[PDB]
Structure 1
Amino acid sequence: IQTQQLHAAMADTFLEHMCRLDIDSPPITARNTGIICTIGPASRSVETLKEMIKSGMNVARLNFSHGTHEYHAETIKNVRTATESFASDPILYRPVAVALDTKGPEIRTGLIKAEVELKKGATLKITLDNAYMEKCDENILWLDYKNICKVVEVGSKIYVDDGLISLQVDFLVTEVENGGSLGSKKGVNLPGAAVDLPAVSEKDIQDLKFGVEQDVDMVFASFIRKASDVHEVRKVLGEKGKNIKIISKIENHEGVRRFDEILEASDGIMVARGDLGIEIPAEKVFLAQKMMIGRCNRAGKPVICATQMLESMIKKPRPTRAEGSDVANAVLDGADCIMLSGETAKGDYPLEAVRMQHLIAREAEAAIYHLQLFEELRRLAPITSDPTEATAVGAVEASFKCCSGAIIVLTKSGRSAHQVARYRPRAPIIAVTRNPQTARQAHLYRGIFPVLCKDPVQEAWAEDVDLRVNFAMNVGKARGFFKKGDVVIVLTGWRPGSGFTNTMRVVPVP
């Protein structure tokens, strides 16, 4: 009772559950929320990447907004070098995924003449004549988006340089709402506009093909506005990249409004709060965040909460109180993963930022009101004929009933473990696979602790099944998830191959 917030777990109301949250109730070792770190000058080396892994990084994120293919290939090579330095012990080997975050379509201003000053309620004309592209000034500004006039109307706002400058409407004349240092080749945002820019730009096609060649596990597809955008990303990945997960980045009003069709078309979602906070009033981000996490939990699809989670840690070795809170509340909301950008890419304390996310995520997971969450997940999920779905909900129920140390799932593609994860058990889900890509991808789903079996396939299938379950038991005992004599849930299928999980057993730890 005095550990894992188990007194708070027993509350009959959410109010009382909150009243019982105890700073003296220590959490277990298992940390269920996946940690995604953006790699950069502060974290690119092998030595550092080894420490990143030890501190808790599960996914290495490569930002293709900048850098060449050569640079990115070397980052990937470094990640795999640091990752396989741990391969010698398969019991302790932690798989590490590689994510490719696309540049995506963007609106950029021209070259000035370099800085200029804009003020109060002055005038500035927006032109598209590619003769003014080299002569940007205080009275006239050129843009690379030719359909800007079609998507904007009388009273529409234009945001310049990550929202620093505000403006009001073959050309458009604007009245400055908020001035400042007008730079050259700066990003432009169109709030409320149904931007008709390509789903995937020319550079993105090249990047996505590079990703297939580099054997990446997932793509974080930028500026996803509709279902067709996801379909274009999927078509570019083709047959060679059919198994690569697609996470759609919701960055503007359109993406939020057309969310249900994007979720159905995608493998998962990223709440890209940075871009979203420029596109929608910042006081509304928390709404879009809580709506997307809720709907992803409802569909059983992975959701990533991103941007400025521990921002002050770029310069400081400890985060602010708002940051500590933001990480906890993203876990409490129901986010599968939490992300680090500048904090691991450019900052002075990358390792400390990763360690803090791990500590907060672990305390937040014990703090979840599983009693309400599990009843609501059950009530909202459809009654289907699927044997694996019934098995998965059965296992979660059994794990709550006997307070099991884990739910051991045998999986080839990962699907069987994903089905367990959508019911959010408190027990860690040990997914035993032989597929190295599945083990990497499994980090996207809350609760899943992926373990790669390297043992050779036995000829008697029932013995091969037993070998993989025993492996999971060994990983559990070694990492102190449970010990000999404890009860665990074990999920297996009625024959080899995917799609047959239908067997739930309550097994003592040997």
Structure 2
Amino acid sequence: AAGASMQSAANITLRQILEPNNVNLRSKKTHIVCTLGPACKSVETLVKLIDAGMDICRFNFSHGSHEDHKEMFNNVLKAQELRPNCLLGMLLDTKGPEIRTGFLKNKEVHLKEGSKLKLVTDYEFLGDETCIACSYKKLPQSVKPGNIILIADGSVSCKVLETHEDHVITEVLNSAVIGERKNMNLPNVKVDLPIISEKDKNDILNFAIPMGCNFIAASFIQSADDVRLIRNLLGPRGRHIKIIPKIENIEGIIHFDKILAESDGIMIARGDLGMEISPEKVFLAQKLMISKCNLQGKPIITATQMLESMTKNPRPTRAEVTDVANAVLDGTDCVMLSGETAGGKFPVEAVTIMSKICLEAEACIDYKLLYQSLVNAIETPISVQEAVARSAVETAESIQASLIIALTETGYTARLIAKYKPSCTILALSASDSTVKCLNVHRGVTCIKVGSFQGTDIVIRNAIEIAKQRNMAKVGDSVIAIHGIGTNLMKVVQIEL
């Protein structure tokens, strides 16, 4: 419940402001999660997204049937075949628990500020301006007098006056018009609904596991026990699938340290979170959560409305540009697009400008000062493995190495290096198909699948050759190689011939 959030020290020159950036968009360090939807169902669009900087594909299971998502998944596989050097991570976002209003007698009601509104748990009641149903049966046992209830993306706020067994009575706090089946939020209240419904269970056990998804973004995580429940559900079958809790309400913030301990990474669901804490507090939660994830070496995705005005316009606002840029400078591993790619009119443009902003933000980071801030903020007894990973980053910066090459079966070594944020690419070499796609969630890590049961030096030399072929390294460069993470080893190789 305390974080000394420190920005990456920035160095900004006139040259960077004035000279065009002409580097490959996939050379960026920050990775992009793209939500798939009708606006990018074509294989042609998906290849264009790949070329624009897409690294992780998000399947939002709040909507759509398994066949709708399976058809999208298969078109992703074809795009993957035409871009075999750009291995994409596959992320399933659970629908999770929802609270909705009921139906209305005349399809719409005009709630008046000052008036009073009854919220009943009989979801079959046709509502009017005086009384509306709520799908959350335990609403009356969850809210207390004085609690605030938000309806329809927070367009209406209601103050709980009385609670009874099958209904609650509120005061409407502002006037607004609302329709049927609108979302509801219960700020500062723990929601007593299953983190994983049978619907969610089916999506995980019969889509995520069989289709080979790499991440589960678990909507509305409120406790470390929610994470353990999902881990147990995945079982040995899904044990290589990473669980990424979505922090969406005050419970998730209160228990963040313990949620993060059980997790493989975090997604900041900023939109939903702004309907539980006040909007002006969301930037504080973003910066605190990013800083805590940085300190633990756990990857974090910043999500929701980073380029929202791009759902219609081909260029973003000045605020959205700094939002993406500052999330990078804050220390995020990934940034996210939702409607900008799933349904908007400029999906390729959105990913393209997002990649360009990331490149500009990354270019101004002071990496020697970033490194020292991390080193000074981490507990003093570190493991041998972490100290060697640390020395790879240090050494690379001191000699201006073009690559750190990490040989890693589980990904552990590459994650330890990524924790210390080197200015050069981390090239992770793994014989695990899972590891090679799971490491995408970490800033600055690119992976190559290699064969099992190979000599370490053969693998490193093969990797250096591939790196040359991909213009990731050239003759006369130094590269760091780290492996064995009992002998943990750091070596420096000059690229010759």
State the TM-score, normalizing by the size of structure 2. 0.92
Matches within 5 A, 1:449-464: 449-453=446-450, 456=451, 461-462=454-455
Alignment partner, residue 135 of structure 2? 144
Alignment partner, residue 17 of structure 2? 23
Alignment partner, residue 116 of structure 1? 109
**What is the aligned counterpart of 1:208 among 200, 204, 208?**
204
Change beyond 3 A, Cα 1:375–1:123: same
Change beyond 3 A, Cα 1:143–1:387: same
Q: Distance in 1 between matches of 2:227 and 2:327?
A: 25
Matches within 5 A, 1:111-510: 111-113=103-105, 114-130=107-123, 133-169=124-160, 170=165, 171-210=167-206, 211-384=208-381, 386-453=383-450, 456=451, 461-462=454-455, 465-493=456-484, 499=485, 502-510=488-496
Change beyond 3 A, Cα 1:303–1:186: same
Q: Which amino acid aligns with 2:292?
A: R
Alignment partner, residue 9 of structure 1? none
Give the CA deviation at 1:48: 1.1
Q: Distance in 2 between matches of 1:480 and 1:117?
A: 62
| Mapped contact 1:95–1:452 kept (Cα < 8 A) | no
Structure 2 spans left out of the alignment, 5+ residues: 1-6
Give the CA deviation at 1:377: 1.2
Give the CA deviation at 1:108: 1.2
> What secondary structure, in the 3-state scheme, does the structure 1 residue paired with 2:54 have?
coil
Q: Work out the percentage of aligned pairs sharing the same amino acid.
A: 45
Give the CA deviation at 1:415: 1.0
| Mapped contact 1:388–1:500 kept (Cα < 8 A) | no
Q: Distance in 2 between matches of 1:321 and 1:501?
A: 51
State the TM-score, normalizing by the size of structure 1. 0.90
Give the CA deviation at 1:302: 0.3
Give the CA deviation at 1:17: 3.9
> What secondary structure, in the 3-state scheme, does the structure 2 residue paired with 1:141 have?
strand
- Residue range with higher mean Cα deviation, 368-377 or 139-148: 368-377
Q: Distance in 1 between matches of 2:11 and 2:348?
A: 33
Change beyond 3 A, Cα 1:489–1:38: same
> What secondary structure, in the 3-state scheme, does the structure 2 residue paired with 1:490 have?
strand
Q: Distance in 2 between matches of 1:26 and 1:372?
A: 26
Q: Which amino acid aligns with 2:432?
A: N
Give the CA deviation at 1:340: 0.5
> What secondary structure, in the 3-state scheme, does the structure 2 residue paired with 1:304 have?
strand
Say whether residues 1:106 and 2:103 are aligned partners.
no
- Residue range with higher mean Cα deviation, 261-270 or 316-325: 316-325
Q: Which amino acid aligns with 2:468?
A: K
Structure 1 spans left out of the alignment, 5+ residues: 1-12, 88-92, 494-498
| Mapped contact 1:268–1:301 kept (Cα < 8 A) | yes
Give CA deviations for 1:241-293 in whole Å, capped at 9, x if unaligned: 11100000000111111100000011000010010011111111000000000
